[PDB]
Each structure stands twice: as C-alpha cells, then as structure tokens.
Amino acid sequence: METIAKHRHARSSAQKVRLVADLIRGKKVSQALDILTYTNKKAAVLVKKVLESAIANAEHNDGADIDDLKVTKIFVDEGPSMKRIMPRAKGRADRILKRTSHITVVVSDR
Amino acid sequence: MKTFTAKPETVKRDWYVVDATGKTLGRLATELARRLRGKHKAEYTPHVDTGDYIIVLNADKVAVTGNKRTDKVYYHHTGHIGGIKQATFEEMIARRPERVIEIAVKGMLPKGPLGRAMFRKLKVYAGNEHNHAAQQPQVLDI
Amino acid sequence: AVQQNKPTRSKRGMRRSHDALTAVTSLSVDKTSGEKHLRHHITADGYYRGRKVIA
Amino acid sequence: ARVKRGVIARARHKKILKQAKGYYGARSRVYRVAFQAVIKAGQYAYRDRRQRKRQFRQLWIARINAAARQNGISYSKFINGLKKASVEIDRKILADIAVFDKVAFTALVEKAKAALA
Amino acid sequence: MYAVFQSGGKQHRVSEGQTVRLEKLDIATGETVEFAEVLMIANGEEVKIGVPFVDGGVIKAEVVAHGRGEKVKIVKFRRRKHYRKQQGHRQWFTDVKITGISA
RNA sequence: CCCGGCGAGGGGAGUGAAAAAGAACCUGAAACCGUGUACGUACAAGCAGUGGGAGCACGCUUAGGCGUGUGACUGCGUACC
RNA sequence: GUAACGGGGCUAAACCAUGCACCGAAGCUGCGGCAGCGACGCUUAUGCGUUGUUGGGUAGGGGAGCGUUCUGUAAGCCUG
C-alpha cells in the first residue's frame, strides 16, 4: 500500500531542491522529519510540508500506522519558466529565466 | 566448425631456471621473450597469455662482443628542462646489474597491457641463489 | 576567454560529484524536559543542561 | 496541390537513428552526427570482410610452426615434404589436428621426413 | 572415428551423426549423397593418410534442407567527390547429416 | 471529509462511455532533464568504430542447442560539405 | 630530449658469389550468385537453349524504377 503527495509549480530550481531531496531517501518518517528540522536551506520547508501531507493522507484515507511508514520514493522534475528582461550597458538587453519545479513523495508500509 | 581459442581460466604454466654465465645478451633475450610470450605451444593465442615462469641467475656475468663494454650508452630524460642523463655498460653492471637484462627483454615484448602482464613472470637475480624452492623449477639450457 | 568545444554532461556530473550535503550525526536529550536539541544549544522551550534559562 | 513532408521526413530520420544504437553521446541522439557514424561503419565492414582471411591464415601458420618444431622439423621443410609426398590437406585442418590429435600429427611428420629423405 | 573430405572448394572434418553446412548442391531433399574422394581416416591408433586419396574410402550422408543465409550490406563512398552507393546480399546453402564412414 | 497560513498545491468521495477528457482541458512526436534494474569502469594514452573474443545476468528446450543485453583483452583505423 | 638503422639488439642478424625451400595483394585458380553486349540453332508476338566476352570512375551524355498530395473508375470496397 503506497500513498502519494505532490507540490506543483513551486518557486525554486530542481537542482537546488534535489540536494535536500537526496538526504531522506529510504529512511523512516520520524528520522526524516528530524533530519529536515535542522537543515538550514529554503527547500527543507517545502519538502517537509509535502511529507507531512503524505503522512496525513496515508493515515486518513488508507488506515495506516505512523510507526510502520517508510519513505519509498521521492523525486523532483522541471516546470515552466518565466521570461523577463534585464537592461545592460550601451543599450543592450538580456533575458532572465525564473525556474520552477514539481515535487513528489511516496510513502509505504513495505 | 570454428577455430580453437584458449581460455585464461584453464591454462598450464611451468617454472624454469636458467644460468647466464658467459652468454650473449641479445641471443639470450630472444629466447627469453619467445618463451614469455608463449610462441612454442600449439595453443598460442594472440589475445591470451600462454607463457611460463622463468628465473635467471648470475645476471652480472653476461657477455658482449667488440668494444661494447666501454661504448654502449644508455640514455634517459627526467622531465625537467635540461635533464638528459646517460650511463655506460660498465657503470650499469657495477650499480644495477639486473636492469641490463630487464631492459633488453622489455624492448622485445608487445607494447600494451598484455605485454606489461607478460613482463611480470620474469625474475632476475645478480648471484647464484633464489628463494623459490617451493615452486620446483626445472633446469633449462639455452 | 571562452570555450572552443561544448562540454559534456559526463563532465558536468564529474565536477558536481563534490556538492553533496551532510546531515547531523546525532541529537542530544535534555535531562529534565526530555526534548531533542543541537549539542551545546538551548531547547525550544528554554532549557539547557537541566535548567530553565528563558521564560 | 500542396504537399507536406512531416510523415516521410520523420520515417527517414527514425530509420537512420535505429542503426546507431549503442554509440556514445550525440552519435546515438542527434541525426546530423549519427548519419556520419553509419557510413563509416559500412566502410569498415567492407574492408574487414577482406582482412579476416589474412588474419586467420596467419594464425594457422603460427600454430603449425609451433607443433612441428616440437617433433623436430620446421614449417618450410614440413610443407616441402608434404608437397613431395602428395598430401593435399590444408592449413585449417592441419592446425585442428595439431591441437586435438598429436599421434596423427606425428604420423604426418614421419611421412614428410620419409619423403624428404 | 573421424574422416576428412572435400566439397564446395573447401575441406571438412567430420564424425558420424553430425550436421554440416555446405555450398548449394543439386540434389532433392530426403535423398542420399556419397563422397568418394577421402583424404584421411582415423580410428584411434589406426591412421590412414591418402596420397592423395584413400583406397576404398567412402562417406554417406543424407540431405536435410536448403535455405538462405543472413543479410549483408555493401556501402561505397568517396569523400568530396560526390559519389555514394549501396547494395545487399544473401547466400545459399545446403545441410547434410552424416550416416556412414567406410574405410 | 482530510493536510496546509480561513493560502498556493494536493489525497479521497461523487459526475461521465472516458478525468492520463479537470478548465495550463482532442491526439501529445524530437531536442533537453530525472527515478528504478542488468553488466562494465579507479597502472590507463588519440575521429570512439569495425574484425576476433572470454566471463556474468536473463528467456524458450530440457536432448545437443538457440535468442536477447553488457563487454575485459587484441589487429586495423587522422569527421562531413 | 637520445634524435643521420622505425626500436630492441647484431661481429653477423654486415658486404661479395653460387644454390635450394618458404612467407607475401581486392593479381591468377577453385565453388556458389547477379547483370550488359555479340554469334549460332527452334522459331519469333519478340521467348527458349548453347556458347564467347565484359561490369573502378569527377565534369557530362543515355536507359529503367520507388514514395507523397489532388481528379475518374467510386451511391463501389474496408471500418465503433
């Protein structure tokens, strides 16, 4: 029995969020929460919220027990980019890209 | 049918012992290289090693012809600018007698990983004794 | 100064092979409250080494 | 009568990219770079169909030399003796026998020696 | 027991019960074929060598199938000279099963 | 109904032939970026493939075979217009 | 940076004369397959059977074919 949680159109870069995602793969949920509580990065907050939502779904829609859950999968993908303009010297112009990501977490008893 | 090919997991190898007193350097090195590579067996295979282990004794008693004891020069370079160095046959025999035979045989072997692995089965000593009595080598006359 | 050839994703990964984060080894347990905290720091309620320090 | 090109173009590109499976980097991902990697492969195959035979004959000859020098003759004299004895076995079969049957090879060497005597 | 014989411009070494692939022959399926130009017969320690053929030596075989082999591609290319060409090829064969060796 | 800041975003329940038709909504190709499994890779020098060729994993047959993926070592080999 | 035999090494594994073997190419022979051009016999609606010979190619000339969109045969044929 597996349960899913997603965060779509999140304001960050996949490269930056994968660093935090790599810390908590294959671990128990309580230990994962403890690890995430003491990481001094901005992506820790987002990943933590997604994990908490997944646990709540697991125990409300599927009748699960917290003490037997495990982070079975986690991944980050790219989203659409916003395009902006930045002036430079001597009348030149430049393009600015603002990147976005999708975050997915899967928890299971097995 | 398809032609036979040797398999490195099942190959026989023997141990031989040779004496170098009063022998010509190149005419000894030819035989040593031939037997290290394994050209004397009907199971010869270019991409496999089918040779034997050979011990050489009395390396500081090899012989050369002509005026080569004073006129054969070994060169090398160090990698720093200006670092070219040379030695003579007599100086080499005085300082490091095994290197003579070692270099001579190395020059005659294939260039690559397989040749580098072939070179590992040669054991050269400067005297008349060795400590490989547990392998039971056989006397080989060249 | 700029590149004459486009690099490869293999080189990108090889360069990034030193960018991994490190986790905290262990957490400490207070002797009165029983909370978890960083070693040599105060707890979230105001304890340090068994004594209340902040209201 | 206006004609479009998408279906045929895609089919051609896919046909070429299916032959580049296993190559490294862009050579199995990009059409411009993978087209050049197929022509060269064809050229090499055409040349190697001819190099194969040379390689195998050389191997057979080396093995026969090794086998004959163990009975006490050299390759050239052995071949001359067989020619004078009117034996017409080829080098492939001779190498096979040298590896898998040694009594027969000794018999052949004696025949050649008797012819040369 | 094994014997050597010649067919199709090439030589083969065989023993009883074996299947052999040769160039195309002009015999129908299920029929018998006889090779009566044999070069060598070996039966353990007994070795007969022809000069060039053994006297009274025969191999009998049966035909099994005809067919076509795997495809090959031919590519020709001359660089900077505006020349390219391509071709394909398959080759015929016959299969026989050895039934008897008589010396 | 539930997690979340009375957010953004999601998991259930329900509509419908179909929700991977959910409003960023027919079909959804390529470049480009990820997660999982099998094999190889830390004494080895070059247009990266071709000819030869062990070992390992897996699918039919269970008689010999045979097919698919990876590929140590070795000969030859300086892109296209 | 050895650096005026490719290298190792060579007193012949150098040079001169005579002889006999062997290696060595996509050249020649062997086995199987495709196509072009002639000659000769039945006879051709332009075919069959024998036989001789040929098939590296830029600029450029000659012959024969594949696939895409639209019109008729089609108020036909395939298809929840």
Swiss-Prot record, chain A:
One Pfam family cited in the UniProt record for this chain: Ribosomal_L22
Would the keyword rRNA-binding turn up in this protein's UniProt record? yes
Domain of life, per UniProt, equals: Bacteria
Q: Which GO terms describe its cellular component?
A: cytoplasm; cytosol; cytosolic large ribosomal subunit; large ribosomal subunit
Q: Do the record's keywords include Coiled coil?
A: no
Which residues are L-tryptophan-binding? Answer: K90
Q: Please provide the record's keywords in A-Z order.
A: Antibiotic resistance, Ribonucleoprotein, Ribosomal protein, RNA-binding, rRNA-binding
Any GO BP annotation: cytosolic ribosome assembly
**A single Gene Ontology molecular function, please?**
structural constituent of ribosome
List, alphabetically, the InterPro entries matched: Ribosomal_uL22 (IPR001063), Ribosomal_uL22_bac/chlpt-type (IPR005727), Ribosomal_uL22_bac/org-type (IPR047867), Ribosomal_uL22_CS (IPR018260), Ribosomal_uL22_sf (IPR036394)
- Entry's family note: Belongs to the universal ribosomal protein uL22 family.
Q: What else is known?
A: The wild-type allele (erythromycin sensitive) is dominant over the resistant allele, and is also dominant over the temperature-sensitive allele at both low and high temperatures.
Subunit record text: Part of the 50S ribosomal subunit. In TnaC-stalled ribosomes forms part of the binding pocket for L-Trp with the leader peptide and uL4.
Q: What does this protein do?
A: This protein binds specifically to 23S rRNA; its binding is stimulated by other ribosomal proteins, e.g. uL4, bL17, and bL20. It is important during the early stages of 50S assembly. It makes multiple contacts with different domains of the 23S rRNA in the assembled 50S subunit and ribosome.
Q: What is this protein called?
A: Large ribosomal subunit protein uL22
Q: Which species is listed as the source?
A: Escherichia coli (strain K12)
What is the phylogenetic placement of the source species in the record? Answer: Bacteria, Pseudomonadati, Pseudomonadota, Gammaproteobacteria, Enterobacterales
Q: Which gene encodes it?
A: rplV
UniProtKB/Swiss-Prot annotation, chain C:
Q: Name one GO biological process term.
A: cytoplasmic translation
What's in the keyword line of the UniProt record?
Answer: Ribonucleoprotein, Ribosomal protein
The source's domain of life comes to Bacteria
One example of the protein's molecular function in GO is: structural constituent of ribosome
Can you name a GO cellular component term? Answer: cytosol
Q: Which Pfam families does this UniProt record tie to the protein?
A: Ribosomal_L32p
Q: Where is this region: Disordered?
A: 1-37
Q: Could you list the residue ranges that cross the membrane?
A: none
Name the family the entry cites: Belongs to the bacterial ribosomal protein bL32 family.
Q: Which PANTHER family does the protein's record reference?
A: 50S RIBOSOMAL PROTEIN L32 (PTHR35534), LARGE RIBOSOMAL SUBUNIT PROTEIN BL32 (PTHR35534:SF1)
Subunit record text: Part of the 50S ribosomal subunit. Contacts L17.
This chain's protein is named Large ribosomal subunit protein bL32
Swiss-Prot record, chain D:
Keywords attached to this Swiss-Prot or TrEMBL record, sorted alphabetically, are: Ribonucleoprotein, Ribosomal protein, RNA-binding, rRNA-binding
GO CC terms of this entry: cytoplasm; cytosol; cytosolic large ribosomal subunit
Extract one GO molecular function annotation from the record: structural constituent of ribosome
One record GO biological process:
ribosomal large subunit assembly
Gene3D superfamilies given in the database record: 6.10.160.10, Ribosomal protein L20
InterPro entries documented for this protein: Ribosomal_bL20 (IPR005813), RIBOSOMAL_L20_CS (IPR049946), Ribosomal_protein_bL20_C (IPR035566)
Can you state the subunit structure given in the record? Part of the 50S ribosomal subunit. Contacts L21.
Q: Family assignment? A: Belongs to the bacterial ribosomal protein bL20 family.
Biological role stated in the UniProt entry: One of the primary rRNA binding proteins, it binds close to the 5'-end of the 23S rRNA. It is important during the early stages of 50S assembly.
Question: What protein am I looking at?
Answer: Large ribosomal subunit protein bL20
Q: Which gene encodes it?
A: rplT
Swiss-Prot record, chain E:
Keyword check for rRNA-binding, yes or no: yes
GO: which molecular function terms?
rRNA binding; structural constituent of ribosome
Keywords of the record, alphabetical order, are: Ribonucleoprotein, Ribosomal protein, RNA-binding, rRNA-binding
Q: Which Pfam families match?
A: Ribosomal_L21p
- Note the coiled coil stretches, chain numbering: none
Write out the GO biological process terms: cytoplasmic translation
PROSITE patterns to which the protein is assigned, alphabetical: RIBOSOMAL_L21
Question: Do the record's keywords include rRNA-binding?
Answer: yes
Kindly list the GO CC terms recorded for this protein: cytoplasm; cytosol; cytosolic large ribosomal subunit
Q: Assembly and interactions?
A: Part of the 50S ribosomal subunit. Contacts protein L20.
Query: Which HAMAP family does the record match to this protein?
Result: Ribosomal_bL21
Q: Which family does it belong to?
A: Belongs to the bacterial ribosomal protein bL21 family.
- Role of this protein: This protein binds to 23S rRNA in the presence of protein L20.
The family database entries (NCBIfam families) matched by this protein are listed as: L21
How is this protein named in the record?
A: Large ribosomal subunit protein bL21
